[PDB]
Write a protein that binds this ligand. Structure first.
Ligand SMILES: Cc1cnc(Nc2ccc(OCCN3CCCC3)cc2)nc1Nc1cccc(S(=O)(=O)NC(C)(C)C)c1
Length: 387
């Protein structure tokens, strides 16, 4: 039944995201072992991830369905071993740009990871599995963060051994990906015409329109929420309080994702109302983050925002999967992720890039809340227009 592929994919997505080195990547990179600097990390290393993410998304979303979703998952596994082997034994900027290239491979193939299970189970489970998948990944993340925040503070574990544990985790995920069951088989304008037949599905260009625009703002909030927290209450101890909050904000999101899989609720006839309710919830949380000068209220707002967004994106992925009616599971997921990344890049050029408006983080989250309020009102007025 659905149990075996779902369990194997959940194990892969757990051990491939249970990465203790993620919260402490910068202290690892800028430190006594790697010996990098904050200039070479944010200007010569980090943008390589974005560039590699866009271009590797290009073949990822074109060719994933054709190769039946397993080799890209296996390619993600091999990229995990290469990325962390180079992180473990890499020196100089040149090697870390290769690390960023392979992490772009990993992040692009996450799209294949999310679509493989849809390619392998019956549509009747497409809801349950959906939540489970998202849930375990988020769970993995918080576990990793916890296994970080515990170890470094209760075993004096150097970041080198954190990355060793991370490599051990992602290598076992490679073995789990090796055991994934293989899904069964089945000019330029023609492809586009097929795309025209793929995005014409019922309520799938609408959920796609939410996915393309909402997750761009979500990634912007993810990137700059740490800066907002540092601006709100600049303290030397916040390093142990920021990530932990995210460790309890991702976990809550996991629960929200687990809400989609577990409960049996007809989403087809209620997905629009849930979409508008949780979109205005995201907007209200983001305005709650910006307006209140209290770090605890801001933490609660971030938790609410992350949980509601994770619930909404789980619903979006499930609703796209059921309504797709074509095998191009990763084509829609990949194109949605690529468009979301393009929108996020354009917005980060406009709002925070020094060549644009150069808005500080005080107004950064006001702009993000306004962006999400526009998303909600566009989607809320659509429901009224239909009725
Ligand atoms: C293991 C690893 C390898 N290479 C990188 N390169 C990289 C590091 C930071 C990046 O963010 C872009 C720059 N922004 C960072 C903050 C302000 C600007 C983009 C790419 N990051 C890595 N870790 C990492 C850094 C940020 C987010 C994540 S995540 O997968 O867990 N995604 C989040 C949910 C945390 C947003 C993981």
């Amino acid at each position: 039944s659905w149990i075996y592929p779902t369990v194997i994919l959940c194990l892969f997505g757990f051990f491939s995201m249970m990465r203790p080195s993620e919260p402490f990547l910068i202290p690892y990179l800028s430190g006594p072992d790697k010996n990098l600097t904050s200039a070479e990390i944010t200007n010569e290393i980090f943008p390589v991830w974005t560039y590699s993410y866009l271009v590797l998304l290009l073949p990822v979303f074109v060719l994933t369905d054709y190769v039946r979703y397993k080799p890209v998952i296996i390619l993600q596994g091999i990229s995990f071993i290469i990325t962390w082997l180079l992180l473990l034994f890499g020196q100089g900027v040149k090697t870390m740009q290769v690390v960023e290239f392979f992490y772009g491979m990993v992040t692009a193939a996450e799209v294949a990871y999310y679509a493989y299970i849809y390619s392998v189970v019956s549509p009747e489970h497409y809801q349950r599995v959906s939540g489970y998948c998202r849930s375990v990944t988020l769970a993995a993340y918080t576990a990793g963060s916890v296994l970080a925040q515990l170890l470094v503070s209760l075993a004096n574990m150097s970041y080198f051994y954190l990355n060793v544990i991370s490599l051990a985790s992602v290598s076992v995920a490679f073995l789990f990906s090796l055991f994934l069951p293989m899904p069964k088989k089945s000019v330029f304008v023609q492809w586009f015409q097929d795309l025209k037949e793929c995005y014409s599905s019922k309520r799938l260009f609408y959920w796609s329109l939410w996915w393309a625009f909402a997750t761009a703002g979500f990634n912007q909030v993810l990137n700059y929420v740490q800066i907002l927290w540092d601006y709100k209450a600049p303290s030397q101890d916040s390093s142990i309080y920021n990530g932990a909050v995210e460790a309890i904000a991702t976990f809550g999101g996991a629960v929200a994702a687990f809400a989609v899989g577990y409960v049996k609720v007809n989403w087809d006839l209620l997905g629009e109302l849930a979409l508008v309710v949780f979109s205005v919830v995201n907007a209200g949380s983001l305005f709650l983050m910006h307006y209140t000068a209290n770090i605890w209220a801001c933490y609660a707002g971030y938790l609410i925002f992350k949980s509601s967004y994770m619930l909404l994106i789980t619903i979006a992925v499930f609703q796209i999967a059921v309504n797709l009616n074509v095998e191009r599971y990763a084509l829609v997921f990949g194109i949605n992720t690529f468009i979301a990344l393009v929108i996020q890049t354009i917005m980060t050029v406009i709002v925070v890039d020094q060549r644009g408006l150069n808005l500080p983080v005080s107004i950064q989250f006001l702009v993000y809340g306004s962006y999400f309020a526009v998303i909600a009102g566009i989607f809320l007025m659509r429901s009224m227009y239909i009725t």
